[PDB]
């Protein structure tokens, strides 16, 4: 089912990058009609400006030149009950670095009851020149190799120590 996964925080210049915004329902069997709002403040600027709105099944984009012709939608398709509100940027540039906000406006339908919900997700990405491997990935490989060599050393030491002792014991009898 739906699993809330956080976006990545590192886009590589010239390439493409997908920004994740997933907002589950508390109960999956419920009915809802969700639309979406994204706002973005560039680093070194203090204002969240609106960039795009996706409702029904149409995507509306503003006139900001930082995103024209290079943003497409990557959420739930043909559902009207979104639960996944992601964004794709083709041809990432240096201007796509700052703080993102994925506003979620949900309307649940109940027996004789209608609820307006709101959830705001905060995403902060920075564009770079060359992707650098995660510190966990760097550390884990080194630890794997050192563990392999340590186990091999321990095994060989035990083999040598046991061989000398048993070879000494042969001459006794």
């Amino acid at each position: 089912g739906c699993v809330e996964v956080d976006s990545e925080t590192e886009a590589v210049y010239g390439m493409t990058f997908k920004i994740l915004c997933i907002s589950c329902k508390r109960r999956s069997e419920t009915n809802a009609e969700t639309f979406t709002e994204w706002t973005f403040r560039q680093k070194g600027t203090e204002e969240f400006v609106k960039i795009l709105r996706y409702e029904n099944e149409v995507l509306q984009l503003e006139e900001d030149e930082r995103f024209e012709g290079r943003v497409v939608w990557n959420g739930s398709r043909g559902t009207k009950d979104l639960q996944d509100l992601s964004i794709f940027i083709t041809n990432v540039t240096y201007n796509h670095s700052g703080d993102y906000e994925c506003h979620v406006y949900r309307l649940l339908f109940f027996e004789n009851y209608e609820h307006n919900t709101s959830v705001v997700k905060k995403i902060h990405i920075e564009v770079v020149d060359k992707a650098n491997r995660d510190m966990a990935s760097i550390v884990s490989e080194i630890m794997m190799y050192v563990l392999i060599v340590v186990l091999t050393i321990w095994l060989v030491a035990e083999m040598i120590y046991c061989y000398k002792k048993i070879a000494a014991a042969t001459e006794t009898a």
Binding site: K25, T30, D84, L108, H115, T117, M144, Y163
Partner: protein, 1145 residues
């Protein structure tokens, strides 16, 4: 003179025949719920016959009018009371006629006397009931303790509901709760799941159920199930604990309690289900079984042109009796069976014609051979062979069926062809031995079946008279349509069906309806009497009968070096630690692994680490042991296969060949790595060795039961093939009126004109012999059986809409299948496996096959611990005050008073309630404080007088520890409830009061013996639980890998699914008792739309589609329930039977 001839008539044999004839017709006449007016005449005739009996016995046994020998016989008291009651009805009317009529069913009890075999079985019933006295007391004690625990932990949880959280006309929860009357009103303010009669439960914890957005979760309103499912009071908690003990619809209790309290409260259930159900049910079984053996052993000891066709006769004789013809005839039987098992619903006409010609060929062969074997033998001698007359009867049935003018209705004849299959028993070695096992004591089985039928008849009539009118006068409180439900007691057949279902172990839903419609007291008394008499006693006597019926030299130096290294204890400890780490790494891979990126990478590399380590271990074992020694060993073969699978997967990943069809399925085999724990822990090794030595006999019994189940499955295919299609309204899942859409064509016309209409079939149906086997498994395990039975009794024809109870009398098919298949087969499996266990114990030389060596030593110490001799008295101190207190406390009256004080404290704990006033809380608090003072004073008094020899008694140590725990728990609970804020921790701490109750077993001789049996049984149960945990782990990983991303339909929901480790183990523990396996199987069985969607996005991951593999699902669930049966049920029973014999010795 007249009295003498009266005696002479009384002793006449005609008396019994006429009287018993009357009672039989009367019993027939008691089954009419709306008798006509002419029935009153024959009713008066019955009263006249019975008073005639009474008068003749009076004259005969009234040598003097004092009537001395008439009242001797208790049955004569029964006759007198029925006569005086009947004439009370005749002379006067008081207004209790239905109750007045209720008593004359006891005239069915005369049937015991006239058949001599019944008195033996009723003697067994009485002696079995007599010896259940200790076990019923122990059951009341244990259920009371567990009911106090459940009342403490879940006192008000089941009243939790989802409240609207936003009210409009300036209201409050109280103002609403005063106004609401009906479910339609409740649904406005509370969250109700679609099609449910109860509001959805939620909890305040983070691991409990979640009330949705816009709803806030509050304790208000009634409990579920009309209000009878609760822990609000000791009586309702006791009902819930009895329901848990009998495992009757206990999975509902499981799921509501977990959804309201929390998923971490499943420890209660585990402890309760494992220790309370099993021990006490198998204790009841053990007591009944040993009572019957001892009684049976006592009984055994106490009792001890013409000559032309004569020449044709000779010729045909020496031509027809060669060994060839019989083997060919059995081959004909097998071929006929294989042909007749190839029937299925969408059968092309060609294939139908094929079976038609095959049927003609086979029936011709059998009838012809019957003629040729008739001609050569004298008919009076030809009928001597018991098998041969059976063959002729089969031939006559097959000829009348074939050559009668074709009729559509008579498919019973069609189903009758199956009976040829039993002729295989003429040559089958094991089946003949089995029928011999019955034939030694078949009188006992017949009399037991007769007693069971009489009991079910009597209870059916009593239920129909007592509760019959209620079900139709207050018909609505139990059905929203104001029409009668599926199970009721308005007719004789349906009352009989309810009593049969209670005998099958399902008594609480029909009981909820009963109490709702006709009062709690009567319904409770009726159902409890029925359950006790049938299920606990008679159905256990059956299993008791079945159980009794079964009774360069440098290379060599290198090799030695590797040998030493591998045999070293540190090496084994390191390897076991690696195995456990590898299994935990498997457990970490949920559907949430995307969020845990770091842990994902760490396990990605740890997998390579473990593969390296285990390849190194394999190589060292190769160098040390050798190839012959290594590959001659099964455990090493298992390890070798797992390492090869892991290496193949790693190489495929390294070479870039990953993301390949077949290879992706080699990653599901990663769930098999836990299997290396089997070779390292001795407990599961001994338990597996116990299970392996019994497979040879399980195979033969399985073969016999497969033949029987195949006959039943082909009968079901004949009766029900393609008739379970129904044309439903998918919005609410309701079958159409069957007068709007009579058949399939109009249903498709509806789908063409309107949407949300579907011509839907059942997922587990009787469409072919393969699916018939699954349906029989559900019917035999009583899980999902009602869904099949409802569509079976509703079937009309193939392309016709079902009608409500059109084929009502198809219930008899399932009654017969249950009786033979379920009961006989499962009991036969149990006895065969237990007898094989006993054979193993004998071969080993009287050694417990469920214990390791150290467990054996500790178990011998435990045995020594419970057969001790009197110890030396504590010497009297001479301080002249210590001496007086020594008298005072050594006196028996002291311990008796302490026991009555403990009983009073138990009663004080029992009166707690949900919603009790603050004054009540204070009063009970202070009574408990005074009790604590009394017990602390008793401890202090024993310490002064007995000095330091107090700690030389095992029970005194327990009492002293309980005193400490009670004082500490009281003070700590006060501190938590005053200063800290933790109601859950406050409840868990206040659970310490229970320790005062457990002190009551000190002065109970029977409870002590049975608990000592459990204490000595504990090690083997620990071994079995260890192996069961390993199996549960493996199946949890495999279901996590396969059955996540499934539609969540019947038994799969937001909390009980296969998405994480905890959820999977919760589901698997539920299914260990075989409870609800149909509901979890059903969402997996659907594979193609509109049942599922193979292109579902599942946000947060890249898995696509939500519907499982029927093959994998069926294999999964069937194998798991079979393994759980074999492991827990049979071995728990065996350990209980051995240790009960040891303990009562």
């Amino acid at each position: 003179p007249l009295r003498r001839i009266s005696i002479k008539i009384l002793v006449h044999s005609l008396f019994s025949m006429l009287i018993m004839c009357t009672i039989l017709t009367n019993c027939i006449f008691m089954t009419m719920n709306n008798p006509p007016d002419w029935t009153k005449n024959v009713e008066y005739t019955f009263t006249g016959i019975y008073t005639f009996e009474s008068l003749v016995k009076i004259l005969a046994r009234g040598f003097c009018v004092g009537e001395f020998t008439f009242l001797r016989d208790p049955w004569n008291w029964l006759d007198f009371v029925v006569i005086v009651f009947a004439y009370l009805t005749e002379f006067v009317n008081l207004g209790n006629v239905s109750a007045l009529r209720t008593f004359r069913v006891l005239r069915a009890l005369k049937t015991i006397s006239v058949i001599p075999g019944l008195k033996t079985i009723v003697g067994a019933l009485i002696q079995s009931v007599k010896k259940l006295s200790d076990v019923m007391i122990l059951t009341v004690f244990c259920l009371s303790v567990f009911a106090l625990i459940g009342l403490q932990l879940f006192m008000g949880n089941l009243k939790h509901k989802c409240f609207r959280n936003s009210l409009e006309n300036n209201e409050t929860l109280e103002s609403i709760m005063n106004t609401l009357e009906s479910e339609e009103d409740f649904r406005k303010y509370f969250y109700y799941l679609e099609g449910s009669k109860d509001a959805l439960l939620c909890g305040f914890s983070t691991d409990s159920g979640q009330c949705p957005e816009g709803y806030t979760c509050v304790k208000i309103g009634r409990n579920p199930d009309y209000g009878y499912t609760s822990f609000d009071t000791f009586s309702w908690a006791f009902l819930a604990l009895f329901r848990l003990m009998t495992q009757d619809y206990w999975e509902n209790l499981y799921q509501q309690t977990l959804r309201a309290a929390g998923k971490t409260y499943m420890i209660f259930f585990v402890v309760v289900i494992f220790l309370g159900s099993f021990y006490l049910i198998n204790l009841i079984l053990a007591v009944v079984a040993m009572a019957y053996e001892e009684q049976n052993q006592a009984n055994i000891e106490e009792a001890k042109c013409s000559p032309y066709w004569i020449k044709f006769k000779k010729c045909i004789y020496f031509i027809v009796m060669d060994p060839f013809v019989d083997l060919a005839i059995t081959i004909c039987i097998v071929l006929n069976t294989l042909f007749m098992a190839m029937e299925h619903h969408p059968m092309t006409e060609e294939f139908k014609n094929v079976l038609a010609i095959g049927n003609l060929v086979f029936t011709g062969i059998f009838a012809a051979e019957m003629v040729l074997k008739l001609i050569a033998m004298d008919p009076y001698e030809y009928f001597q062979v018991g098998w041969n007359i059976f063959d002729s009867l089969i031939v006559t049935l097959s000829l009348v069926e074939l050559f009668l003018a074709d009729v559509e209705g008579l498919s019973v004849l069609r189903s009758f062809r199956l009976l040829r299959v039993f002729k295989l028993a003429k040559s089958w070695p094991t089946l003949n031995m089995l029928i011999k096992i019955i034939g030694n004591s078949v009188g006992a089985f017949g009399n037991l079946m007769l007693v069971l039928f009489i009991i079910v008849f009597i209870f059916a009539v009593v239920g129909m008279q007592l509760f019959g009118k209620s079900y139709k006068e207050c018909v609505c409180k139990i059905n929203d349509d104001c029409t009668l439900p599926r199970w009721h007691m308005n007719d004789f057949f349906h009352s009989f069906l309810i009593v049969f279902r209670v005998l099958c172990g399902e008594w609480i839903e029909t009981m909820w309806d009963c109490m709702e419609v006709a009062g709690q007291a009567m319904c409770l008394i009726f159902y409890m009497m029925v359950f006790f008499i049938g299920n606990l006693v008679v159905l256990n006597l059956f299993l008791a009968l079945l159980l009794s019926s079964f009774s360069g030299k440098i290379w060599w130096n290198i090799r030695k070096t590797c040998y030493k290294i591998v045999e070293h204890s540190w090496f084994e400890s390191f390897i076991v630690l690696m195995i456990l780490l590898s299994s935990g790494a498997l457990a970490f891979e949920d559907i949430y692994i995307e969020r845990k990126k770091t842990i994902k990478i760490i396990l990605e590399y740890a997998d390579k680490i473990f593969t390296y380590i285990f390849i190194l271990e394999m190589l060292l074992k190769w160098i040390a042991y050798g190839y012959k020694t290594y590959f001659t060993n099964a455990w090493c073969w298992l390890d070798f296969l797992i390492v090869d699978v892991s290496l193949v997967t790693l190489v495929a990943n390294t070479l870039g060949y990953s993301d390949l069809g077949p290879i992706k399925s080699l990653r599901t085999l990663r769930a098999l790595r836990p299997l290396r724990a089997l070779s390292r822990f001795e407990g599961m090794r001994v338990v597996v060795n116990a299970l392996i030595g019994a497979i040879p006999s399980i195979m033969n019994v399985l073969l016999v039961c497969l033949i029987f189940w195949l006959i039943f499955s082909i009968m079901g295919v004949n009766l029900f093939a393609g008739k379970f299609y129904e044309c439903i309204n998918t919005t609410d899942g309701s079958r159409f009126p069957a007068s709007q859409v009579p058949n399939r064509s109009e249903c498709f016309a509806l789908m063409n004109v309107s949407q949300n209409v579907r011509w839907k079939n059942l997922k587990v149906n009787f469409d072919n012999v393969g699916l018939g086997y699954l349906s029989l498994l559900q019917v035999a395990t009583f899980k999902g059986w009602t869904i099949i039975m409802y569509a079976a009794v509703d079937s009309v024809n193939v392309d016709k809409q079902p009608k409500y109870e059109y084929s009502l009398y198809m219930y008899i098919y399932f009654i017969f299948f249950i009786i033979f298949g379920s009961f006989f087969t499962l009991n036969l499996f149990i006895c065969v496996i237990i007898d094989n266990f006993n054979q193993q114990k004998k071969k080993l030389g009287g050694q417990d096959i469920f214990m390791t060596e150290e467990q054996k030593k500790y178990y011998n110490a435990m045995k020594k611990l419970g057969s001790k001799k009197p110890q030396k008295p504590i010497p009297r101190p001479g301080n002249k005050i210590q001496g007086c207190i020594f008298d005072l406390v050594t006196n028996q009256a002291f311990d008796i008073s302490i026991m009555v004080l403990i009983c009073l404290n138990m009663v004080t704990m029992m009166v707690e309630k949900e919603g009790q006033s603050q004054h009540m809380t204070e009063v009970l608090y202070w009574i408990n404080v005074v009790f604590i003072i009394l017990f602390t004073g008793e401890c202090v008094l024993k310490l002064i007088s007995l000095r330091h020899y107090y700690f030389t008694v095992g029970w005194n140590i327990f009492d002293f520890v309980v005193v400490i725990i009670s004082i500490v728990g009281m003070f700590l609970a006060d501190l938590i409830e005053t200063y800290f804020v933790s109601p859950t921790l406050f409840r868990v701490i206040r659970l310490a009061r229970i320790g005062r109750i457990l002190r009551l077993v000190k002065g109970a001789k029977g409870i002590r013996t049975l608990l000592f049996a459990l204490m000595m049984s504990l090690p083997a149960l620990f071994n079995i639980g260890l192996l069961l945990f390993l199996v549960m782990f493996i199946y949890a990983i495999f279901g996590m890998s396969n059955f996540a991303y499934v539609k969540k339909e019947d038994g799969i929901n937001d909390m009980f699914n296969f998405e994480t480790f905890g959820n999977s183990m919760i589901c698997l523990f539920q299914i260990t008792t075989s409870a609800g396996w149909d509901g979890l199987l059903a969402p997996i069985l659907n594979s193609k739309p509109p049942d599922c969607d193979p292109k579902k996005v599942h946000p947060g991951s890249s898995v696509e589609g939500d519907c499982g593999n029927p093959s994998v699902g069926i294999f999964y669930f069937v194998s798991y329930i079979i393994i759980s049966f074999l492991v827990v049920v049979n071995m728990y029973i065996a350990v209980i039977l051995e240790n009960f014999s040891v303990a009562t010795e």
